[PDB]
Design a protein around this motif. Structure first.
Motif, short mmCIF file in Angstrom:
data_model
loop_
_atom_site.label_atom_id
_atom_site.label_comp_id
_atom_site.label_asym_id
_atom_site.label_seq_id
_atom_site.Cartn_x
_atom_site.Cartn_y
_atom_site.Cartn_z
N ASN A 27 35.57 68.14 54.70
CA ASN A 27 34.62 67.55 55.63
C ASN A 27 35.09 67.72 57.07
N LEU A 28 34.18 67.44 58.00
CA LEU A 28 34.45 67.57 59.41
C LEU A 28 35.32 66.43 59.94
N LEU A 29 34.92 65.19 59.65
CA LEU A 29 35.67 64.03 60.11
C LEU A 29 36.93 63.82 59.28
N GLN A 30 38.04 63.55 59.96
CA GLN A 30 39.32 63.34 59.30
C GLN A 30 40.12 62.25 60.00
N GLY A 31 40.65 62.56 61.18
CA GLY A 31 41.43 61.60 61.92
C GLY A 31 40.60 60.83 62.92
N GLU A 32 40.64 61.27 64.18
CA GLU A 32 39.88 60.62 65.24
C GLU A 32 38.39 60.92 65.09
N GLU A 33 38.08 62.04 64.46
CA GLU A 33 36.69 62.44 64.26
C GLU A 33 36.02 61.52 63.25
N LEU A 34 36.82 60.93 62.39
CA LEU A 34 36.33 60.02 61.38
C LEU A 34 35.72 58.79 62.03
N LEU A 35 36.33 58.36 63.13
CA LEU A 35 35.84 57.19 63.86
C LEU A 35 34.65 57.58 64.73
N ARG A 36 34.72 58.76 65.32
CA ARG A 36 33.63 59.26 66.15
C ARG A 36 32.44 59.62 65.28
N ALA A 37 32.73 60.06 64.07
CA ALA A 37 31.69 60.44 63.12
C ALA A 37 31.13 59.22 62.41
N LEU A 38 32.02 58.40 61.85
CA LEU A 38 31.60 57.19 61.14
C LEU A 38 30.62 56.38 61.99
N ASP A 39 30.71 56.55 63.31
CA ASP A 39 29.83 55.84 64.23
C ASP A 39 28.60 56.67 64.56
N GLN A 40 28.01 57.27 63.52
CA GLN A 40 26.82 58.09 63.69
C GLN A 40 25.70 57.61 62.78
N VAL A 41 25.48 56.30 62.80
CA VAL A 41 24.44 55.69 61.98
C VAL A 41 23.07 56.26 62.32
N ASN A 42 22.48 56.98 61.37
CA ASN A 42 21.17 57.58 61.57
C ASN A 42 21.19 58.56 62.74
N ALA B 69 48.33 56.87 49.45
CA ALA B 69 47.20 56.95 48.54
C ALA B 69 45.90 56.62 49.26
N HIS B 70 45.88 55.47 49.93
CA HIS B 70 44.71 55.02 50.65
C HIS B 70 44.35 55.97 51.79
N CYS B 71 45.29 56.83 52.18
CA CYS B 71 45.04 57.78 53.26
C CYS B 71 44.18 58.93 52.76
N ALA B 72 44.78 59.75 51.91
CA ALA B 72 44.08 60.89 51.34
C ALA B 72 42.80 60.46 50.64
N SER B 73 42.90 59.40 49.84
CA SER B 73 41.75 58.89 49.11
C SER B 73 40.63 58.51 50.06
N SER B 74 40.94 57.64 51.02
CA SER B 74 39.96 57.19 52.00
C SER B 74 39.35 58.38 52.75
N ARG B 75 40.16 59.42 52.94
CA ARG B 75 39.70 60.62 53.63
C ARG B 75 38.56 61.28 52.87
N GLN B 76 38.66 61.29 51.55
CA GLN B 76 37.63 61.89 50.70
C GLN B 76 36.39 61.01 50.64
N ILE B 77 36.59 59.69 50.66
CA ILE B 77 35.48 58.75 50.61
C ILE B 77 34.51 58.97 51.78
N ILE B 78 34.98 58.69 52.99
CA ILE B 78 34.16 58.85 54.18
C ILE B 78 33.69 60.30 54.33
N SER B 79 34.59 61.24 54.05
CA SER B 79 34.28 62.66 54.16
C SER B 79 33.03 63.00 53.35
N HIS B 80 33.03 62.60 52.08
CA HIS B 80 31.90 62.86 51.20
C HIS B 80 30.61 62.32 51.80
#
Ligand SMILES: [Zn+2]
Ligand SMILES: [Zn+2]
Ligand SMILES: [Zn+2]
Lengths: 42, 101
Positions: A27-42, B69-80
């Protein structure tokens, strides 16, 4: 032996992929992008 | 290849939702304090923990082959979730049933 301890119910890379996979190609979001991405509701 | 059994238990889908909801929570939970200035640590082991796991992932460029565990795992959760598009999302569906308007 690597017997890491944890209280929060953890899941395996498979338990997640099986229940909800990304469809190949990380996926695209991982580290900091996860927070910037997770905040993309609709 | 793994075992080659192709397991699948829906009873766990519930745990996947909470982790997706707590992550969603913790995501906004941390953004809720900024609005109310200096706030106390909300009574929610899940959130607080995710706040910790989140800080990790932010520096876990490895992913999957990390040491948490919660790192890699959580990464797949949100990623998906986000990567999920035009499919039979069994988790995103119950969490945010949106596809057939
Ligand atoms: Zn919280
Ligand atoms: Zn990690
Ligand atoms: Zn999905």
């Amino acid at each position: 032996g690597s017997m890491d301890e944890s209280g929060l119910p953890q899941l395996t890379s498979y338990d997640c992929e099986v229940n909800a996979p990304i469809q190949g190609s990380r996926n695209l979001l991982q580290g900091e992008e996860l927070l910037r991405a997770l905040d993309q509701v609709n | 290849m793994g075992s080659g059994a192709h397991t699948a238990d829906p009873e766990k889908r519930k745990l996947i939702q909470q982790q997706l909801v707590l992550l969603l929570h913790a995501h906004k939970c941390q953004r809720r304090e900024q609005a109310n200035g200096e706030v106390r640590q909300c009574n929610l082991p899940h959130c607080r923990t995710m706040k910790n796991v989140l800080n990790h992932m932010t520096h876990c460029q490895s992913g999957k082959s990390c040491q948490v565990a919660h790192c890699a795992s959580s990464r797949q959760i949100i990623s998906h979730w986000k990567n999920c598009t035009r499919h039979d999302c069994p988790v995103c569906l119950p969490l945010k049933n949106a596809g057939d308007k």
